[PDB]
């Protein structure tokens, strides 16, 4: 066994004033893998976990730039992070 490879194909599907919806694909095979979503304002650091390859980030600041990483995790440990994805919430 070994840590999983990174999540793949990360897309920011929708963005609103206070939410951002994320989509991705499971990592290349290395067992059960879950995910760690780290996001922050790009100008506190937030971290949430998910079992499915989608996440709706909530109660974000309007008209704000965000960075987001996603990591895969199994019972060995976490993958190397995704590349950083940039998105921007809609102004109020």
Residue numbers in the entry: 291 to 320, 324 to 336, 341 to 389
Question: What does the publication say?
Answer:
Recently, a shortened Dscam (sDscam) gene family with tandemly arrayed 5′ cassettes in Chelicerata species has been identified, which encodes ∼50–100 isoforms. Chelicerata sDscams could be classified into two subfamilies, sDscamα and sDscamβ, containing one and two variable Ig domains, respectively. Crystal structures and cell aggregation assays demonstrated that both α and β subfamilies of sDscam used Ig1 for the isoform-specific trans recognition in a hand-in-hand manner. Furthermore, the cis interactions were established by the three FNIII domains of sDscam, which assemble into a cross fold with a kink between FNIII2 and FNIII3.
We found that FNIII2 alone but not FNIII1 or FNIII3 could promote cKIT tyrosine phosphorylation, suggesting the essential role of FNIII2 domain in mediating sDscam cis interactions. The gel-filtration analysis supported our observations in the crystal structures: Ig1 mediated the formation of trans homodimer and all the three FNIII domains were involved in the cis interactions.
